[PDB]
Design a protein around this motif. Structure first.
Motif, mmCIF file in Angstrom:
data_model
loop_
_atom_site.group_PDB
_atom_site.id
_atom_site.type_symbol
_atom_site.label_atom_id
_atom_site.label_comp_id
_atom_site.label_asym_id
_atom_site.label_seq_id
_atom_site.Cartn_x
_atom_site.Cartn_y
_atom_site.Cartn_z
ATOM 1 N N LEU A 146 -29.631 -0.368 -31.221
ATOM 2 C CA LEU A 146 -29.159 -1.037 -29.978
ATOM 3 C C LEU A 146 -28.128 -2.123 -30.307
ATOM 4 C CD1 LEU A 146 -29.814 -1.433 -26.837
ATOM 5 C CD2 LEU A 146 -31.192 -3.361 -27.629
ATOM 6 N N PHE A 147 -28.368 -2.919 -31.348
ATOM 7 C CA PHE A 147 -27.443 -4.028 -31.696
ATOM 8 C C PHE A 147 -26.066 -3.494 -32.109
ATOM 9 C CE2 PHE A 147 -31.579 -6.304 -31.666
ATOM 10 C CZ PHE A 147 -31.307 -7.118 -30.591
ATOM 11 N N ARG A 148 -26.021 -2.372 -32.830
ATOM 12 C CA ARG A 148 -24.721 -1.743 -33.191
ATOM 13 C C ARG A 148 -24.005 -1.292 -31.912
ATOM 14 N NH1 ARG A 148 -22.048 -0.858 -34.983
ATOM 15 N NH2 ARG A 148 -21.522 0.693 -36.579
ATOM 16 N N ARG A 149 -24.744 -0.739 -30.949
ATOM 17 C CA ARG A 149 -24.162 -0.244 -29.671
ATOM 18 C C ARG A 149 -23.543 -1.406 -28.885
ATOM 19 N NH1 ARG A 149 -29.003 2.439 -26.986
ATOM 20 N NH2 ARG A 149 -29.546 2.577 -29.202
ATOM 21 N N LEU A 150 -24.201 -2.571 -28.852
ATOM 22 C CA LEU A 150 -23.717 -3.735 -28.055
ATOM 23 C C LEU A 150 -22.589 -4.499 -28.763
ATOM 24 C CD1 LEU A 150 -27.241 -4.963 -26.900
ATOM 25 C CD2 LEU A 150 -25.646 -3.507 -25.637
ATOM 26 N N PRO A 151 -21.708 -5.215 -28.024
ATOM 27 C CA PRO A 151 -20.619 -5.998 -28.620
ATOM 28 C C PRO A 151 -20.927 -7.501 -28.755
ATOM 29 C CG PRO A 151 -20.302 -5.868 -26.252
ATOM 30 C CD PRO A 151 -21.656 -5.261 -26.563
ATOM 31 N N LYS A 152 -20.172 -8.227 -29.596
ATOM 32 C CA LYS A 152 -20.414 -9.649 -29.774
ATOM 33 C C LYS A 152 -19.738 -10.442 -28.660
ATOM 34 C CE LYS A 152 -18.517 -9.276 -34.030
ATOM 35 N NZ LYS A 152 -18.116 -9.768 -35.376
ATOM 36 N N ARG A 153 -20.169 -11.691 -28.500
ATOM 37 C CA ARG A 153 -19.714 -12.506 -27.381
ATOM 38 C C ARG A 153 -19.728 -13.978 -27.764
ATOM 39 N NH1 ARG A 153 -18.198 -11.959 -21.757
ATOM 40 N NH2 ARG A 153 -18.782 -13.870 -20.632
ATOM 41 N N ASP A 199 -37.131 -1.855 -25.662
ATOM 42 C CA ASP A 199 -36.403 -2.279 -26.850
ATOM 43 C C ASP A 199 -36.926 -3.589 -27.422
ATOM 44 O OD1 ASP A 199 -34.130 -0.178 -26.746
ATOM 45 O OD2 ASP A 199 -34.028 -1.103 -24.759
ATOM 46 N N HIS A 203 -31.840 -11.640 -38.270
ATOM 47 C CA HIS A 203 -30.851 -10.566 -38.213
ATOM 48 C C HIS A 203 -29.551 -11.139 -37.665
ATOM 49 C CE1 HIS A 203 -28.995 -6.678 -37.563
ATOM 50 N NE2 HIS A 203 -30.037 -6.083 -38.112
ATOM 51 N N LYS A 240 -25.604 -12.381 -32.760
ATOM 52 C CA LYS A 240 -24.267 -12.473 -32.191
ATOM 53 C C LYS A 240 -24.114 -11.675 -30.903
ATOM 54 C CE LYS A 240 -21.775 -13.180 -36.507
ATOM 55 N NZ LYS A 240 -21.586 -12.454 -37.793
ATOM 56 N N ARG A 241 -25.199 -11.107 -30.373
ATOM 57 C CA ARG A 241 -25.111 -10.224 -29.221
ATOM 58 C C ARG A 241 -26.126 -10.519 -28.125
ATOM 59 N NH1 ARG A 241 -23.435 -7.167 -34.233
ATOM 60 N NH2 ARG A 241 -21.974 -5.527 -33.574
ATOM 61 N N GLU A 291 -34.061 3.413 -36.121
ATOM 62 C CA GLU A 291 -34.312 4.299 -34.993
ATOM 63 C C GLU A 291 -34.398 5.765 -35.401
ATOM 64 O OE1 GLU A 291 -32.696 4.257 -31.267
ATOM 65 O OE2 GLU A 291 -32.893 2.108 -30.878
ATOM 66 N N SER A 325 -24.720 -8.084 -23.566
ATOM 67 C CA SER A 325 -23.461 -7.658 -22.984
ATOM 68 C C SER A 325 -23.553 -6.181 -22.602
ATOM 69 C CB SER A 325 -22.313 -7.927 -23.958
ATOM 70 O OG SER A 325 -22.211 -9.308 -24.257
ATOM 71 N N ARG A 326 -22.435 -5.613 -22.167
ATOM 72 C CA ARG A 326 -22.378 -4.227 -21.729
ATOM 73 C C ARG A 326 -21.572 -3.391 -22.714
ATOM 74 N NH1 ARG A 326 -23.834 -3.958 -16.442
ATOM 75 N NH2 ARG A 326 -24.262 -1.748 -16.876
ATOM 76 N N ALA A 327 -21.655 -2.067 -22.548
ATOM 77 C CA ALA A 327 -20.917 -1.135 -23.432
ATOM 78 C C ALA A 327 -19.805 -0.450 -22.631
ATOM 79 C CB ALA A 327 -21.873 -0.134 -24.021
ATOM 80 N N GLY A 354 -26.604 -9.927 -37.391
ATOM 81 C CA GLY A 354 -25.889 -9.047 -36.484
ATOM 82 C C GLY A 354 -26.436 -9.080 -35.072
ATOM 83 N N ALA A 355 -27.749 -9.265 -34.929
ATOM 84 C CA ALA A 355 -28.369 -9.320 -33.611
ATOM 85 C C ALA A 355 -28.231 -10.684 -32.951
ATOM 86 C CB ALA A 355 -29.849 -8.946 -33.709
ATOM 87 N N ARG A 414 -39.443 -3.314 -30.338
ATOM 88 C CA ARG A 414 -38.926 -2.878 -31.629
ATOM 89 C C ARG A 414 -38.202 -3.982 -32.388
ATOM 90 N NH1 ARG A 414 -35.234 -0.040 -30.026
ATOM 91 N NH2 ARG A 414 -36.420 1.776 -29.280
#
Lengths: 64, 78, 49
Positions: free
Chosen positions: C8-15, A53, A6, A11-12, C2, A24-26, A8-9, A56
């Motif tokens: 969760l990944f959409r909610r979090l930002p890249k770094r 989490d 994934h 990168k976070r 979900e 990271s935080r929101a 997208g995942a 999943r």
RNA sequence: UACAAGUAGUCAGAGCCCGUUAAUGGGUGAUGGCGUGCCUUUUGUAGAAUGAACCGGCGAGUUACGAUUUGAUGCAAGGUUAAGCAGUAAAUGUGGAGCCGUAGCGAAAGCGAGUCUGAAUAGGGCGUUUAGUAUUUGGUCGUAGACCCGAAACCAGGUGAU
RNA sequence: GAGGGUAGCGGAGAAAUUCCAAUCGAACCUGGAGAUAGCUGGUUCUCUCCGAAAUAGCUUUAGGGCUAGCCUCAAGUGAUGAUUAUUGGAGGUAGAGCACUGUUUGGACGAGCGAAUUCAGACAAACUCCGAAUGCCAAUUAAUUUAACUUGGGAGUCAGAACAUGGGUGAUAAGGUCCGUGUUCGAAAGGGAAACAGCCCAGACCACCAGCUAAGGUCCCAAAAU
RNA sequence: GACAAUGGUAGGAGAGCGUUCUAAGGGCGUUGAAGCAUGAUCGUAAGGACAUGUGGAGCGCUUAGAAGUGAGAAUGCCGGUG
RNA sequence: UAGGCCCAAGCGACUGUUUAUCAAAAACACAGGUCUCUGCUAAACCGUAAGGUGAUGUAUAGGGGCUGACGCCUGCCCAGU
RNA sequence: UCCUAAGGUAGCGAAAUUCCUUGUCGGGUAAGUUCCGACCCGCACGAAAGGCGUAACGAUUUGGGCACUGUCUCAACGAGAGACUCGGUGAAAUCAUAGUACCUGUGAAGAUGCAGGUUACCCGCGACAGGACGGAAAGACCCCGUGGAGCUUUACUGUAGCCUGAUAUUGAAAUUCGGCUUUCUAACCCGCACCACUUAUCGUGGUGGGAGACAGUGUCAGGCGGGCAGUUUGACUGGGGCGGUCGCCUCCUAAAAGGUAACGGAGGCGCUCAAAGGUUCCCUCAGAAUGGUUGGAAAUCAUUCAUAGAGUGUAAAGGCAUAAGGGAGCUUGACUGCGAGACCUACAAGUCGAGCAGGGUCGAAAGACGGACUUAGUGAUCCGGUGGUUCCGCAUG
């Protein structure tokens, strides 16, 4: 064929030495005039993916 | 043929958090309240939103402070 | 997935980012040098064989 | 067996006719007690909710590549080869590019049993807990129709004014 | 009548969505193709142990899904689980009361005289000078008991029902509807209530032409006192 | 020889029966194999033997391996007959 | 073998046409009226290329919209589209 | 007396149009919700999606008469074909197994099959049609699916086509306060004429005439464009529509811990303040049984009653006279780097916090200060903008 990661995942989060994932935080992009100083200062610290989490999205990061 | 009511806010979990005679740490919350319905005692502080917390390790003690007034204190264990 | 709630990944930002000129090395602690002869000469060409 | 009200059986039980893989035997049944089929779907079905006239045959979680966990087995700070080459389409011998492990931390330069943040080992975060690796039985997941049967439709190229 | 012409993203129509080979709001055949179906139906041998849920939060969500909560199988850490007696605390319900905010009956006293004076008698989910029975949180206190917690593998469940009891809603109507608490059914046979999933008693390992009891019963149907 | 456990749907766990094929070992068959029919037989269940008639050439057993491995329902498909 | 007739109203003028197979009508068509587009390689239409219909026609002509024999009539508004 | 671009004329009118309504008044009948003739209170007639009349025509709609009749009062008889009895031949839908009674009751709330009663010897044939929620068609009405198809438009995004400019094809000359325009042949065009191929005018070629750097054609650009195409158009809900509602804060229902529903009962928020913040010292309120420069008893001043009945930026509920309420002086802590331990909690988030280091403000000093008596005034990420900077930047700078 092999499973795909994934992107997208990937990168976070990062993989720690014990098998955990750092994230990271929101609430950190904008609107800082509506948040307190203590609220913004304590949001700069990182966290780990919760134990709920991980159940999943385990296979989503099987190659990282 | 309609209703004008139907609104309400989320419930806050107010009240005591530790019992009398129980052992606690230096930063344990003891009572959440609006205003000052219970006053702090020995080795107790009042937070910004009127929350009562301890400052040392010891037993909790709910006692009376004057006619129709209550306090909470903490004493080190010996 | 979900069920409709934001993932969760959409909610979090890249770094961060990646460096193209990343140099890595093969670490060898002072514990793995207890097998050679006293006073011997240790060279990468030998450690690899 | 022709005075009788029965999901048709079960338990109790005279009379009559037989005699077996030989044992606390076989067939028939005057009369008495008890008892509203099966499956699916439902809070709940004797249901007047669904399905099957009867008999036989056929008729629905499988395989290939990846991931993870458990059992077994060889070796162990190491473990193991892929294509190819020689061989009976044998499954052996060669083949060490390559992959995992032995060391983390940081977005990165980088440093290193320590590192990041910080003016400050002041405090705090993640590591120094640190045994691994190859093959394989079982369970589950992913990409492939993916347990089986069934649409109203969409597009492409052709055939039709008896 | 005979011989010809116009073809589906199209023809024909003195116009009805009318006709184009016996079903035309868009003909027929083959192929993409095992299109897709969060919806129905079906899914094949036998025993042993354990055993649910019909709830919360979010949802282009409401007969779907995800995490949490309840089930099961392993590897672990050790009284950390449960009931009772006792000593302590936090919290304003039932009842009661009129000292506050209201509402409100009958008199007495002249400041314009039945409710911001006084003497009596009442009322309240959003009134309280007062205030239980219970329940809840504690004390590595005491006795009786058998759990509890952490990590990992696999699940199912998100349509609930009646009875008793504390309330809202409706009309102190409903086998109505929405919440608190316990039991039963669901997934539970056996006896009683004539028949009768939810009521009362009680939890079926198997066999026997043995005994004592529960609910409910003892004139006859029909076991037990005319 | 002692006390204690064993109702159960959705589900989790464990041990087994039978069918076709394969590799080794050991055996039956024209003095009658498989299949079929009948019977009063054995095991805790799925199931396993024996005797007789029919039949006329193949088929069991032991350990292990591999699967198109088990049917009463799908207005299910085909054949036969009420 | 071979027209019942008569006194009064609604609709459409009339012959004609229509839902093969539940509707034949007050629905469609019609003669007439009016508006508008088109000077000829005409407009319009099919292909939207060539090539054709219109038309081997030329405004007393051809295409399109709305009314619907005949008789008497058809008023007011141009802010909006 | 208001408003509008103008406020319906002729005719007709309870009508194929009139809801109230069987309007009212006259005809026809012994009796008329229909029919004919008149009245205008026209919900909601009206002049080419024409208005009002009209002879002749109609398998058209409507009311009233004559004649006639089994339509009827009210049925009867006769003829033929089936039915019915024999010989021949011989199907179909349907079907869990059936030795298949009634009454009251009970049950998933309408029983041949359950309870208690009543009645009934075994088996055929000709008839009736009440019930087996009888049999033919996965109910067309209704509601559901983030299911289809056809149609519409000032729903969204496109497109055939058409219109308009720049440039290539494309060359001359002159007028003219790196140029629209009169101007000429040589490109290009002509379903224009006469000739040849050829006794066919499709086509090619040649000579005349017309037109002319326009038109036509390619690329680029702007506008119009349901003509055509692909799609979207929420949920909750005592069925669905219509109405109302959707996030956050406070109170009651809520059954003295916490938590807890309904389209149950009441309100508020999408801010504000540079002092309405911090600190140090001072102070204390409503109402004021009466006196007064006597103004429809309450502005201002004076003395006592005064258990807070006042205030506290803004809803409500808990708090505050040891003040959190009022005033007066100096100030910017409405600071930087964090942070043991707790509350809440599915996740993401949210809340309190001693204490340590660096700067400071106020106070004589202890000491207080990380905004406001407390609880609402707010929204991931992805993408883009503006500053600062240790860092990277494709062979090297």
């Amino acid at each position: 064929p092999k499973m795909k990661t994934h992107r997208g995942a990937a990168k976070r989060v990062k993989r720690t030495a014990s098998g955990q994932l750092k994230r990271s935080r929101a609430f950190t992009s904008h609107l800082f005039a509506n948040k307190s100083t203590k609220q913004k200062r304590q949001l700069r610290k990182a966290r780990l993916v919760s134990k709920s989490d991980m159940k999943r999205v385990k296979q989503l990061l099987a190659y990282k | 043929s309609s209703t004008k009511n139907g609104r309400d806010s989320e419930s806050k979990r107010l009240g005591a958090k530790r019992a009398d005679g129980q052992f606690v740490t230096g930063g344990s919350i003891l009572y959440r309240q609006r205003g000052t319905k219970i006053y702090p005692g020995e080795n107790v502080g009042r937070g910004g939103d009127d929350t009562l917390f301890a400052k040392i390790d010891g037993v909790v003690k709910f006692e009376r402070k004057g006619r129709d007034k209550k306090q909470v204190s903490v004493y080190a264990v010996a | 997935f979900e069920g409709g709630q934001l993932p969760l990944f959409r909610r979090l930002p890249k770094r961060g980012f990646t460096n193209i000129n990343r140099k890595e090395y093969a670490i060898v602690n002072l514990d793995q040098l207890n097998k050679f002869e006293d006073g011997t000469e240790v060279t990468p060409a030998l450690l690899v064989e």
